[PDB]
RNA sequence: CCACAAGUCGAGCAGGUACGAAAGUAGGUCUUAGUGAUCCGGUGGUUCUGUAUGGAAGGGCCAUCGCUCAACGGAUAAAAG
RNA sequence: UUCUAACUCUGUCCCGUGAUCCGGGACGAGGACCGUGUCUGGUGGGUAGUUUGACUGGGGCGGUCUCCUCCUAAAGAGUAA
RNA sequence: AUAGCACUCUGCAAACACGAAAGUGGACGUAUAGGGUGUGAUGCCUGCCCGGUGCUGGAAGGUUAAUUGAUGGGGUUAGCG
RNA sequence: GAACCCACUGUCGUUGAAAAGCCAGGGGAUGACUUGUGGAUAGGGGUGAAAGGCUAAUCAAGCCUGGUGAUAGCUGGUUCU
RNA sequence: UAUAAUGGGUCAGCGACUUAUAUUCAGUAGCGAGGUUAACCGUAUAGGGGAGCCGUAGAGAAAUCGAGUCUUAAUAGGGCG
RNA sequence: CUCCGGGGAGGCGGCAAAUAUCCUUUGAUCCGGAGAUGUCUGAAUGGGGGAACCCACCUACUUUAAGGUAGGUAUUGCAACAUGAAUACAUAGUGUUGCAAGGCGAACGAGGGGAAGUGAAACAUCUCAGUACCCUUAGGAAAAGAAAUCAAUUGAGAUUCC
């Protein structure tokens, strides 16, 4: 499923609004992709499905802390 | 349920001691050709006509 | 991305310089290959205080 | 005069004018056709209002501008087989 | 114009394994392209909701839809095709 | 509908089709193959037009969407009169 | 040319023996043939040598339940003195 | 409409202007320049509960004033009281 | 069927009445409470399956022929332990034990998705309406809840309902 592991972002619902104010249902989707990150503590590559905001959070906090937080939450990585 | 007012009419009619007052038409945009007498006499408020008082009463119960 | 260098690079710096690199350069090359580490407060303090002499002695 | 919305004629009073020596005449042209309600927005004034207070924005009032809405009392801003 | 580290392989080999899925490891061919998220111009009967006036000696075609003057109008007003 | 004929697309992770994706058919096939379209055994044959619409190729000359944000104008805020 | 599969003409039947038949003739009958058992394709979808044909005696959008007591400027009706 | 315009084969039973809320007018009863409670408490149709509502003053878009008030240079004229 | 308590002239349930056996003052029938037994299907859980069926394995006691009896054998999640690749440590994987979950059911709560008829005397903005419907999930209620809140005579003090 299109669920970001780091942030939990998922597709949401909204409207296409035209020039005559006709409305139709639409979905806004996240910028989700698969990425391999190096982990020295375990000496391995970990593959995560995440967003660019998640990448920014990883850059800010470090791979070790984010991976530990996800494991504590319950994700198996 | 409670009766509901017709807000469009409530924005055009106000209540007097014995009736309703209103503004007059034909004074908005096209004015150059109109005569000065018409310009002056169409200004101000007038009274609602008796024939139409009943509909105003129906549309504005609480005023 | 601000990173302190743990190795000599031709243009970036030499042995402890703090330099600004494009995000991808650090994310995918320098940090994973060990040539630089993000200039967080704790990392900078540790590098400047404890392992500076060890890194210098590890000349090559 | 008129179902309504509207339309038409007008003595006379106050102010400032033009033409007459003066009494006086003049509120468009001999008259009856030359036209468009409401909503929305633009412009000049305004002793009105101004979401705690002083301002401002915005709103109201007077004047005025934008429809061949001619299917001309004008379904919606926009519609053939 | 080169490079490889993100990234692609419905290419070979090794393991989970007894397996033409999948995962991991090695190699090889590509490579900052392709592709995806947000925003944005164009195209869009493929699909979807609709519209396409009234009068009228039946309907359609034609004509007309608002205003002014005369006659019909029967010496006050008004009076239809 | 048919055997035959002709135009057009597709270099393989093919084009095309189904599906929301994963993926599946095309095909465990590879331009002597696969899809779309028209005509319709065979014999003799199949004239003119590229102005219009479409398709294909080129041109970089005019118009600009997001984005970016020069300059100008305005409200309030200090001190002076 | 029998079996088997079809349905070209005529009579009868039309509250039928039968919600599609009987009788007398008629066409294919080694093939693009006929047929049993068990499977796959589901409604704006499926399948169609193509008739808008078929999809349970129902098809220019199946059936059942729910929104639902839909709306109807139309037709009918509306009870003793 | 005797109509050859519609409906009814006959009998028995069933079958269609309601209910809640708000408002306006009339009749009737209480009180009266005053009238009245709501939710709620209450061994509860009692008693308590005055928040609130209608009436007692209009004019003006409004500031504002007030038996007066709007318009205006105007104690004129005029509109509403 | 057993036990405890109540009760004292009848009773062997009904459609469905009858004869016959029969039980009962050493106390029946009947009423209340606590226990014993409780075939097969069904979340069904040893595998399969066209529900109430077919087939199989392990352990222990009996057995002599080709049987009986009593248990155990599902998946997922978590924890402990053991074993254990590519690959040298590791890791993935694998296995045993212990615990927990699945399903059903009236309405009410919370959350994810979400129409159209109709009205506007046509209709697209709007209305119908966050309604109908689908999906996930808790409790006896749920949710909310203690101000980066209102107010403006410079005051009131968490949520919820009338």
From Swiss-Prot, chain B:
Pfam families: Ribosomal_L35p
Gene Ontology cellular-component annotations: cytosolic large ribosomal subunit
Gene Ontology biological process terms in this record: translation
Source taxon at top rank: Bacteria
Gene Ontology MF annotations: structural constituent of ribosome
Keyword Cell inner membrane among UniProt keywords: no
Gene3D superfamilies: 4.10.410.60
PROSITE patterns on file: RIBOSOMAL_L35 (PS00936)
InterPro entries from the UniProt entry: Ribosomal_bL35 (IPR001706), Ribosomal_bL35-like (IPR021137), Ribosomal_bL35_CS (IPR018265), Ribosomal_bL35_sf (IPR037229)
Keywords: Ribonucleoprotein, Ribosomal protein
Family: Belongs to the bacterial ribosomal protein bL35 family.
HAMAP family assigned to the protein according to its UniProt record, in alphabetical order: Ribosomal_bL35 (MF_00514)
Name of the protein described by the UniProt record: Large ribosomal subunit protein bL35
Organism the protein comes from: Acinetobacter baumannii (strain AB0057)
Swiss-Prot record, chain C:
UniProt entry tagged with the keyword Cell cycle: no
Record carries keyword RNA-binding: yes
UniProt GO MF annotations: rRNA binding; structural constituent of ribosome
Keywords: Ribonucleoprotein, Ribosomal protein, RNA-binding, rRNA-binding
Cellular component, GO, one term: ribonucleoprotein complex
Superkingdom, taxonomy of origin: Bacteria
Gene Ontology BP terms: translation
Function: Binds to the 23S rRNA.
Family the entry assigns: Belongs to the bacterial ribosomal protein bL9 family.
Name assigned to this protein: Large ribosomal subunit protein bL9
Organism, scientific name: Acinetobacter baumannii (strain AB0057)
Phylogenetic lineage: Bacteria, Pseudomonadati, Pseudomonadota, Gammaproteobacteria, Moraxellales
Gene for this chain: rplI
Residues of the full protein shown: 1 to 60 of 148
């Amino acid at each position: 499923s299109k669920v970001c592991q780091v942030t939990g972002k998922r597709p949401v619902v909204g409207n296409n609004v035209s020039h005559a104010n006709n409305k139709t249902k639409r979905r806004f989707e996240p910028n989700l992709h698969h990425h391999r990150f190096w982990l020295e503590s375990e000496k391995r590559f970990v593959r995560l499905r995440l967003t660019t905001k998640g990448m920014r959070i990883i850059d800010k906090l470090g791979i070790e802390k984010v991976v530990a937080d996800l494991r504590a939450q319950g994700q198996k990585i | 349920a409670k009766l509901k007012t017709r807000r469009g009419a409530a924005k055009r009619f106000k209540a007097t001691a014995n009736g309703f007052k209103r503004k007059q038409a034909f004074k908005r945009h096209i004015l150059t050709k109109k005569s000065a007498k018409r310009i002056r006499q169409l200004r101000g408020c007038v009274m609602v006509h008796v024939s139409d008082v009943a509909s105003v009463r129906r549309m504005c119960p609480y005023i | 991305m601000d990173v302190i260098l743990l190795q000599r690079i031709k243009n970036l710096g030499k042995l402890g310089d703090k330099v600004s690199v494009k995000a991808g350069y650090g994310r995918n090359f320098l940090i994973p290959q060990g040539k630089a580490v993000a200039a967080t407060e704790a990392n900078t303090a540790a590098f400047e205080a404890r392992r500076a002499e060890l890194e210098k002695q590890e000349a090559e």
